[PDB]
């Protein structure tokens, strides 16, 4: 109390003041923009939702004693807000109760009164007209309530709060979404409640119970129209079915719901991660690595974020399933130190023709390979141990004797050198050909890639994308 | 104090890291270490060398004497003589830190330099201290101090005085050769070789010529290399002193490739005796070996690697394996062959070169306006 | 040293003489504008970053 207790009065009141006026001006601003000029995609909806991912998770973790978040429940226990006097009565109460919680002690939430902080705030004439207010101020008290992590009769405090909030969401979904479309708000609300309800089903039994309900929310999605609702629920529905290590992937191959068609640069980024995971395991290697490449370069705007460490981890494997390998560890992180040492020393052995070192890597770093969800490399990367050099030779040489290629690939027999090169050309490693008469493996024709109509194909791709930006820009620019 | 000092940092390297090399460095360092009053840094250097000898307490009281003899000078000075700035308190207390740079470690010297930097008002005395920080950052190759004060030398100082910056031009590319920047920034401002006397600010001349002739044949192949280093005459004086260096030049320019390897063999082994050496040797030779190949495959388009067996060196299979490693490296734009034994080349045309650059820069700006169009419109 | 427009062959001992294409100018003037257009997108990149 003389050391830290004197610096206990400054942390409540300024987050009680100006952080309160954030959602007070936003929730006032989002409501009036839901009333008039209802197409508010170009408004404060997005960045406030970018804040609720980032800011309010690190603005507060505990329920903020001396009445900053512990005071939110005696603040919003009494909200009528129904008619224009009932709002202006409560606008006086927004002045009164915030002043009382800024001065003195209201109902102090000592981590236990959460269900009477879900009835009586929802009671005392709380509206479904302010269903964004009930939607936000039920999803935001998940975050002091989960991140306490004491988990002692709080799992049901999670469970009741989500079912209250989603029954409010269902009551929106059937009754009068008059020019509002709370799906923009309630998508990440459906996500954030079910990131941790997934975590609840990590501490306890399996989470196909989530997936049956998540089909039902996706069944009521896609029927109205798609405005990010199908997009957010699809990545959620895919994740457990990929997280389970059963068969599980032909369900996604038949999942013909491939189109969100616009995803605000962030759903589309990790959507391409999960479908790249799928196309890699069913041996469609070349299409997988190029959409893994598209996923890697789409959201790098982060700070050592860890899933960037994951997409970078898979992409080097699938290109080691194609022979080529780039520089990888040139952007070393405080966490990449753990993940560079296996895979750089892995491809060190892949480029060489060594195998007793390669099996030494497997015994050294099998636990991390099993932890990363990549058991399958040992059955599929031993293929490209011979396919790396034969692509390297057919890139270097032009007309090789197959007798000479056996010692150069240390194949220890000249007669099966027909068969590997037959496997290379039938699968399309190199466009070369064999003369089965005196040992020739001769290469392609002369390079003719300017006067043979091929520059027109790439030039048509760049027309069809660049002026497509032009037409999409002119429509999107002039709203007034 | 600091002026002949950098040869010591050569013998710190040469004695230590080649463990076989423990014969001749200690023969002319220890007799130089009992001289010059060198007392603080050599304790770890005596650990890696032969273990101990009792001259430590001999010069300990002698380094304490000249510490105290000039400490009592400038404390009596500041208590009797009442000028400040660049006063007698100034040049006595910089003589304390220059007693530290010659004798002590860096840490007492650098904090006395920062103590005396804010007591100055003239930029010439400021820059001479920044000369000292750059040299002591070059003693111990500490890459943190040298990046800072060079910006201090550029921005905060050298909008004033003049032609004490060419002394630090040789230090800007002393940084670039100890870095991997062996390519263009070193050879560009090494090219003004008109700085002659082997001073503190010009640490050597003849080895400076060898430094700027080794780095020179990577910056440029023939966009008139021959005017700046071969038609250059003031460079041609002192490479007339060194016959092996001049032979290394003219073998490459007059296309004598067999004696070029014998010259390049001596260079790489002679490079081993250097203290800014770590970026050079594994990268320098392989860049020059692929440099000689590229111009030799030029002027031919049907070469046979049997002609490499005598016009070039020997080793039919040696040329075969080294071209194979370099074609697979993405460099050395030609196509090696087996049983025909004809090194055919393939170089692009104008249009086949220009089409590749426009499709690389095209997709770069296309991706650039992909992301920008997604930042706007939510 | 570009005194001559030809090429040699070791496998034939045969000198071959050809010419040069001077039509580089259109593609050369094209890709210099991309260096200009790369900077104007960077100019609009931080213009949207400074204020939304």
């Amino acid at each position: 109390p003389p050391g830290g207790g004197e610096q206990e009065p400054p942390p409540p009141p300024a987050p009680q003041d100006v952080e309160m006026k954030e959602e007070a001006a936003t929730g006032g601003g989002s409501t009036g923009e839901a009333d008039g000029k209802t197409a508010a995609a170009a408004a404060e909806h997005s960045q406030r939702e970018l804040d609720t991912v980032t800011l309010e998770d690190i603005k507060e973790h505990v329920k903020q004693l001396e009445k900053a978040v512990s005071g939110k429940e005696p603040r919003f226990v009494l909200r009528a807000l129904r008619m224009l006097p009932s709002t202006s009565r409560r606008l006086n109460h927004y002045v009164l109760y915030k002043a009382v919680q800024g001065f003195f002690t209201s109902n102090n939430a000592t981590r236990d009164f959460l269900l009477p902080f879900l009835e009586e705030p929802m009671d005392t004439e709380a509206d479904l007209q302010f269903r964004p207010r009930t939607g936000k101020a039920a999803s935001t008290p998940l975050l002091p309530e989960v991140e306490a992590y004491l988990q002692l009769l709080v799992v049901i405090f999670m469970m009741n709060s989500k079912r209250y909030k989603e029954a409010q969401k269902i009551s929106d979904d059937l009754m009068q979404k008059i020019s509002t479309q709370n799906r923009r708000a309630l998508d990440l609300v459906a996500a954030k409640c079910y990131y941790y309800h997934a975590r609840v089903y990590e501490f306890l039994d399996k989470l196909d119970v989530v997936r049956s309900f998540l089909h039902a929310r996706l069944r009521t999605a896609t029927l109205r129209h798609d405005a990010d609702g199908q997009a957010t629920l699809l990545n959620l529905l895919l994740r457990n079915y990929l997280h389970y290590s059963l068969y599980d992937q032909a369900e996604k191959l038949v999942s013909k719901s491939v189109f969100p068609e616009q995803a605000n640069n962030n759903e589309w980024a990790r959507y391409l991660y999960y479908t790249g995971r799928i196309k890699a395991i069913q041996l469609e290697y070349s299409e997988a690595r190029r959409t893994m490449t598209n996923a890697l370069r789409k959201a790098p705007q982060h700070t050592a974020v860890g899933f960037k460490q994951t997409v970078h981890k898979l992409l080097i494997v699938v290109e080691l399933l194609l022979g080529e390998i780039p520089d990888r560890l040139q952007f070393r992180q405080p966490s990449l130190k753990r993940s560079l040492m296996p895979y750089f020393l892995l491809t060190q052995a892949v480029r060489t023709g060594n195998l007793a070192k390669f099996n030494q890597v497997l015994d050294q770093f099998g636990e991390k390979f099993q932890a990363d969800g990549t058991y399958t490399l040992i059955i599929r990367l031993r293929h490209n141990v011979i396919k790396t050099g034969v692509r390297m030779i057919s890139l270097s040489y032009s007309r090789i004797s197959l007798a000479d290629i056996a010692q150069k690939l240390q194949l220890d027999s000249p007669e099966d050198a027909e068969f590997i090169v037959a496997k290379a050309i039938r699968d399309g490693v190199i466009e070369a050909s064999i003369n089965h008469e005196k040992g020739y493996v001769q290469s392609k024709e002369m390079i003719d890639i300017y006067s043979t109509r091929e520059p027109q194909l790439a030039f048509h791709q760049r027309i069809s994308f660049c002026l497509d930006i032009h037409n999409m820009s002119v429509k999107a620019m002039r709203f007034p | 104090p600091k002026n002949p000092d950098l040869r010591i940092a050569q013998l710190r390297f040469l004695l230590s890291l080649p463990e076989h090399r423990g014969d001749a460095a200690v023969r002319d360092e220890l007799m130089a270490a009992v001289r010059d009053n060198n007392m603080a840094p050599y304790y770890e250097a005596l650990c890696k060398s032969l273990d101990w000898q009792i001259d430590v307490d001999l010069l300990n009281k002698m380094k304490k004497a000249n510490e105290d003899e000039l400490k009592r000078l400038d404390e009596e000075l500041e208590d009797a003589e009442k000028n400040l700035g660049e006063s007698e308190i100034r040049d006595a207390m910089m003589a304390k830190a220059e007693y530290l740079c010659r004798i002590g470690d860096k840490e007492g010297a650098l904090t006395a330099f920062r103590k005396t930097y804010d007591k100055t008002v003239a930029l010439g005395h400021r820059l001479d201290i920044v000369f000292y920080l750059l040299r002591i950052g070059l003693f111990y190759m500490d890459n943190d101090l040298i990046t800072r004060n060079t910006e201090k030398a550029k921005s905060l100082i050298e909008e004033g005085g003049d032609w004490d910056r060419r002394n630090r031009l040789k230090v800007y590319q002393g940084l670039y050769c100890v870095a991997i920047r062996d390519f263009k920034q070193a050879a560009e401002l090494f090219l003004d070789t008109v700085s002659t006397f082997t001073s503190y600010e010009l640490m050597d001349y003849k080895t400076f010529v060898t430094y700027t002739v080794y780095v020179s044949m990577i910056a440029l192949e023939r966009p008139d290399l021959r005017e700046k280093v071969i038609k250059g005459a003031e460079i041609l004086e002192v490479l007339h002193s060194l016959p092996a260096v001049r032979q290394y030049l003219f073998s490459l320019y007059e296309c004598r490739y067999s004696v070029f390897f014998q010259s390049l063999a001596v260079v790489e082994q002679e490079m081993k005796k250097d203290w800014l050496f770590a970026p050079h040797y594994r990268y320098y030779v392989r860049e020059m070996r692929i440099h000689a190949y590229s111009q030799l495959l030029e002027s031919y388009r049907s070469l046979t690697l049997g002609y490499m067996a005598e016009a070039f060196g020997v080793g039919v299979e040696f040329i075969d394996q080294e071209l194979s490693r370099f074609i697979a490296a993405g460099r050395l734009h030609c196509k090696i062959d087996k049983v025909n034994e004809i090194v055919e080349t393939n170089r692009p045309d104008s249009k086949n070169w220009q089409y590749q650059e426009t499709i690389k820069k095209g997709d770069l700006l296309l991706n650039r306006v992909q992301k920008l169009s997604r930042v706007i419109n939510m | 040293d570009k005194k001559f427009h030809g090429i040699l062959d070791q496998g034939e001992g045969v000198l071959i003489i050809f010419d040069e294409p001077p039509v580089d100018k259109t593609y050369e003037a094209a890709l210099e504008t991309i260096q200009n257009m790369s900077k104007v997108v960077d100019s609009l990149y931080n213009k949207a970053k400074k204020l939304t």
Binding site: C466 | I376 | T33, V40
Partner: peptide, 30 residues
Amino acid sequence: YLASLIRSVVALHNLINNKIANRDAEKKEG
């Protein structure tokens, strides 16, 4: 590359010039 790109960037310039001048009159009405 010369006509489709440059016409797009000009129309992209009209995006930011509109959206700045839109909301700065919006947030400064009251």
